[PDB]
Each structure stands twice: as structure tokens, then as C-alpha cells.
Amino acid sequence: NSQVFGVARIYASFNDTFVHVTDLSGKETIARVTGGMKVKADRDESSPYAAMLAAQDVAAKCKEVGITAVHVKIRATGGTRTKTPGPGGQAALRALARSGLRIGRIEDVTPVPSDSTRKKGGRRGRRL
């Protein structure tokens, strides 16, 4: 087993997707290209086509540095927000695997409270 491990941290909100690779410790990040700078439209920042384009750019950089395999940790916005991973999470996780990188230990790391502070809207909701 000569694989060298990184940690691919994927932040999938409904506004943008983050693909972020560090080493085993969270310091010394390797590559981080967001979904919002592969398409310049300000509304397709969370699109799955944007997230897979970003995920190829991490894998091209991770191959250059030397990282061959990765542990992927995926999160949603969390806290008092939606807790549902955005549309870019599934495309970015898939596109890392087809790029030649190896993958192990998929884990959900969405920050989930213990009935913490208040939320959007104010008791009548964001009404539309």
C-alpha cells in the first residue's frame, strides 16, 4: 500500500460548491477551487456542471503535488441552515473518483446543533 492520503473537504451549499484538499491534518491545504469560478454567471455557481469542473482542477493539482488517494468529508451549510447537501456535492464527489484518484472513508461532517440559536424569517417565514 503505497498510496499517500489527503482529505478532500467538500462544502456543498445551495449557492456555491467548495472542493478543498488538505493533508491528514487540516493545516497545509493542497488545492481549493470553488464551483463559482469555473462558470461566470453568478447563478450557476452551485450547478453540478460547475462542481465537476472544479473537482477536475483539484485532481490535476493533487496529481502534480503527489497526492494519489483521498478521504472525502462532505458537509452541507449546517448550523441553523438547511442540513441538506447542495446539488454540487454529488457531482464533485463523483468527478474526483473518475479523475484517477483513489477514495476511502466517505463521511458526513455537516454541523448539526443541539437546539442552538434562532433562524431565518421570524416566525412567519420567508414568505413568497
Partner 1 sequence: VVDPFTRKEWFDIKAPSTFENRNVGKTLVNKSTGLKSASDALKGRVVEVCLADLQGSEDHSFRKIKLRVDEVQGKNLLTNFHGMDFTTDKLRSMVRKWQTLIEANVTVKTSDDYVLRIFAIAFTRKQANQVKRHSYAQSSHIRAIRKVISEILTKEVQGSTLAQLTSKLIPEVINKEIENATKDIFPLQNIHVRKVKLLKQPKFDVGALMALHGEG
Partner 2 sequence: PKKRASNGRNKKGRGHVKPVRCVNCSKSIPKDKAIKRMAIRNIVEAAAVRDLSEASVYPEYALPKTYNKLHYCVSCAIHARIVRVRSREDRKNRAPP
- Contacts with partner 1 by CB under 8 A lie at 4-5, 23-25, 27-28, 65, 105, 107-110, 112
The one-letter code for the residue type at 59 is A
| φ/ψ of residue 38, rounded to 5 | -95, -20
4 binds, among partner 2, RNA, partner 1, none (CB under 5 to 8 A by kind): partner 1
Q: In the block, which residue shows the cell 455557481?
A: 45
Query: Where along the sequence are the contacts to partner 2 (CB under 8 A)?
Result: 1, 3, 69, 74, 80, 82-85, 90, 93-94, 97-98, 100-108, 119-128
If the CB atoms of residues 97 and 109 are measured against partner 1, the closer one turns out to be 109
DSSP state of 80: T
Distance CA 19, CA 17 (A): 7
If the CB atoms of residues 40 and 123 are measured against partner 2, the closer one turns out to be 123
If the CB atoms of residues 50 and 58 are measured against partner 1, the closer one turns out to be 58
Distance CA 96, CA 112 (A): 26
